[PDB]
Amino acid sequence: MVLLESEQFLTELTRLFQKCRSSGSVFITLKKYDEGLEPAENKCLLRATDGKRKISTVVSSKEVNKFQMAYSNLLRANMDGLKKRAQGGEQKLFQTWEEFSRAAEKLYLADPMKVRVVLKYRHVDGNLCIKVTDDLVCLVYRTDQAQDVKKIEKFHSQLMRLMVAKESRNV
Template sequence: MMELLDHDTFLQRLAALFESSKEHGSIWLTHKRLIYEGAAITMGSVGGADGENDYPCLVRVTDGDAVKFSTTVNSNELEKFHHAYGTLLKASMTTLRKRDKKREKQRAEQVARRKKKMTEPVVVDGPKRGNGRRKRQRQLKAAGKQEESQRKAKQREEAANAKSASAP
């Protein structure tokens, strides 16, 4: 069950959650515009005296398991809250791991080599019988594998295109 807290308690509990998950664990933070049940979803033209609706911001925190709490921030309190919230986030996110760019580069190069190998045609040469027959057989097997991988890649691409075309 999600627990609704005031701003100060929310920030204190969030700081405690960051402290408890310093060694391991994840924390999910979400920000959403709060819409009440049955309220109109459209913004702008309908609403208050000056023609604009005032929607509070809902800030949620969870560790994915037992800890779940949130707070609502009205637009007139938003700047003050974000100042305190931003300060807390900057202070708490010092233990983030740096990206391993060397490993990412190696993986990108490996993927590029695989794609290049898949697109380069395999040349089948050599005698069908006698010396060099085994070499020719390996080349034929490699050509068959390459055709199969190209066919599978084409199917995946078509499925992805069909999925993106059907998505709104």
């Protein structure tokens, strides 16, 4: 795997999406990650693969806004081979997107350090899949509607912001 820079990751990601158009899938995983005395630096690890070549990057609160503007655009642009214009969540151990989102959100807030957010895009099949799990409870949401790409991206991206957000702890 290869730890990359913000922009080196985004270019490498784009290449993954490009190589899996005739076949394959692109998986993306997100997760919280852990002289003069500075309060530290909250982060999230971002990994992606096409089954052969594995890449990763570490985003912090100092660059989520700038990163996310590029990252959000790249997801929407590259995940474009969907039903022009199947759908539905699962509570494993929701039909509506609404029920899925809420459930996945509580699962995240429960224990931020143990939860993994997964994205799987299969261009050839014309389907996108998002999974939020803590390895015990699993919540997935499958779609083939090009209209669901936007909200699935915005959501996945908001979780990223929660992972990175800094909290004024009070010593």
